[PDB]
Design a protein around this ligand. Structure first.
Ligand SMILES: N[C@@H](Cc1cc(I)c(Oc2ccc(O)c(I)c2)c(I)c1)C(=O)O
Ligand SMILES: CC1=C(/C=C/C(C)=C\C=C\C(C)=C\C(=O)O)C(C)(C)CCC1
Lengths: 218, 250
């Protein structure tokens, strides 16, 4: 039942997340670089992540970093009206996004992610779990034994479903309402990555060390 | 307790069976070839892109695609909480989910002995054939889902309910009913969960394992849109049926 403890997962979230240039695209890139450090910390603090081969740990984090970071900033922004809150304490607004041309994907984030997490009042335990389900992706190319990864993902499905039924018995379809936020994140995360490479090539947007390392081959 | 507790993993709570039945039949009537799709199976003769579109295989698709989109419309029409939706709001939902439902409808008719999907229940096509005829790498994506969904042993109700879920996405651009559409999906999911509990599949974690396929479908949709733009370059817009243009152009 708890071969993946929701409390151990919620703890990872709290261990990295605290309590609540000019170019928005550059500011977001700065935030992303800082968070790539914290991301690996959070990852190691998730049950059984550190037990996988070191190359697999990399494979998984290299694969889901975008979606993970997107989810994490989107949940922090639940308060932040019409805009997004960065890990650098900075705020980026809908209008400023449009000015940078990035208004289309930004509107998608605010709507499909922030709004939906806000409307449903998504807690940090569920967030952690969704992020953990994204982390544990067996479909990732090159991992030595994906069955271990798949098993760990299945372990999160179980624990998250269990927590949902326990903490929210009134909401009988909360667990599916949460899982259905993942197609939106997969879709959004993919377009954000495209823009990132488009901005990486133009050269005009300054991408820091870790973010760069993600945007290049290993 | 124990007894009070052992009323866990529920089955469809009465009204849910009315819903299950309306939808199961909405999909049953709209699923082109019914119980005789294996019997009425017409293999496409060996003629087969990632663009460089094989117009001979593309033509056979453009033929059958006009009724296919229509069925995806018919099914939605029959669902009462959809029928009750505004002019705009229900066209946005119909545009967004069209290809998802079509791919899902195609993927469920995959047979591994022959390595073929069955378009509109009439035409059986191979991986190379669907690719070269305009779908390109979207073909592999549909084929791979057909392999993946085979283990799930989905039935007419499962499919019908998945279709209703794909249709009721509150995460589409420019929606005004919103919560009205969101609660429609909420009800349909709850029923789908219960029907799944009732079905008792030989698969552990079936419900989440299934719901994750929504991403695969959502992605088959998104790639189709880009794959359509590449078709538009490689064409003639006159080759595209007006309905196909209605759904996909914009
Ligand atoms: N088979 C489904 C309906 C369905 C019909 C056809 I033609 C299909 O192929 C496509 C679709 C879009 C395209 O642009 C091209 I080029 C080919 C698929 I995938 C599905 C059913 O049974 O309802
Ligand atoms: C390339 C790009 C984007 C990608 C951002 C990504 C991939 C991560 C952001 C992480 C942050 C912002 C972390 C944090 O604050 O903790 C978005 C669409 C959002 C803005 C414009 C273009």
């Amino acid at each position: 039942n708890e071969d993946m403890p929701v409390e151990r997962i919620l703890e990872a979230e709290l261990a990295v997340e605290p309590k609540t240039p000019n170019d928005p695209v550059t500011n977001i890139c700065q935030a992303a670089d800082k968070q790539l450090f914290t991301l690996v910390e959070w990852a190691k603090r998730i049950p059984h992540f550190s037990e996988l081969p070191l190359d697999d740990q990399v494979i998984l984090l290299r694969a889901g970093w975008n979606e993970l970071l997107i989810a994490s900033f989107s949940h922090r922004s639940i308060a932040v009206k019409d805009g997004i809150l960065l890990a650098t304490g900075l705020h980026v607004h809908r209008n400023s996004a449009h000015s940078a041309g990035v208004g289309a994907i930004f509107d998608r984030v605010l709507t499909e992610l922030v709004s939906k997490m806000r409307d449903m009042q998504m807690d940090k335990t569920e967030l952690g779990c969704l992020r953990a389900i994204v982390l544990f992706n067996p479909d990732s190319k090159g991992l030595s034994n994906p069955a271990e990864v798949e098993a760990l993902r299945e372990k999160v499905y179980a624990s998250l479903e269990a927590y949902c039924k326990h903490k929210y018995p009134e909401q009988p379809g909360r667990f599916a309402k949460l899982l259905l936020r993942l197609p939106a994140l997969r879709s959004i995360g993919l377009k954000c990555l495209e823009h990132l490479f488009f901005f990486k090539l133009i050269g005009d947007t300054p991408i820091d060390t870790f973010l760069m390392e993600m945007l290049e081959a290993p | 307790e124990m007894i009070k507790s052992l009323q866990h993993r529920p089955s469809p709570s009465a009204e849910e069976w009315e819903l299950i039945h309306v939808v199961t039949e909405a999909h049953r009537s709209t699923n082109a070839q019914g119980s005789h799709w294996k019997q009425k199976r017409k293999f496409l003769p060996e003629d087969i892109p990632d663009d460089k579109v094989d117009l001979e295989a593309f033509s056979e698709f453009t033929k059958i695609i006009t009724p296919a989109i229509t069925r995806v419309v018919d099914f939605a029409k029959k669902l009462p909480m959809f029928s009750e939706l505004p002019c705009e709001d229900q066209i946005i939902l119909l545009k967004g989910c069209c290809m998802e439902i079509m791919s899902l409808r195609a993927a469920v008719r995959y047979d591994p002995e022959s390595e073929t999907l069955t378009l509109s229940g009439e035409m059986a096509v191979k991986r190379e054939q669907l690719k070269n005829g305009g779908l390109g790498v979207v073909s592999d994506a549909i084929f791979d889902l057909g392999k993946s969904l085979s283990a799930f042993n989905l039935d007419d109700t499962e499919v019908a309910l998945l279709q209703a879920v794909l249709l009721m996405s509150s995460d589409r651009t420019g929606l005004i009913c919103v919560d009205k559409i969101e609660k429609c999906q909420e009800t349909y999911l709850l029923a789908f969960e219960h029907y799944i509990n009732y079905r008792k599949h030989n698969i552990p974690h079936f419900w989440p394992k299934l719901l994750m396929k929504v991403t695969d479908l959502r992605m088959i949709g998104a790639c189709h849109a880009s794959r359509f733009l590449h078709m538009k370059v490689e064409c003639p817009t006159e080759l595209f049926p007006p309905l196909f243009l209605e759904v996909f152009e914009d």
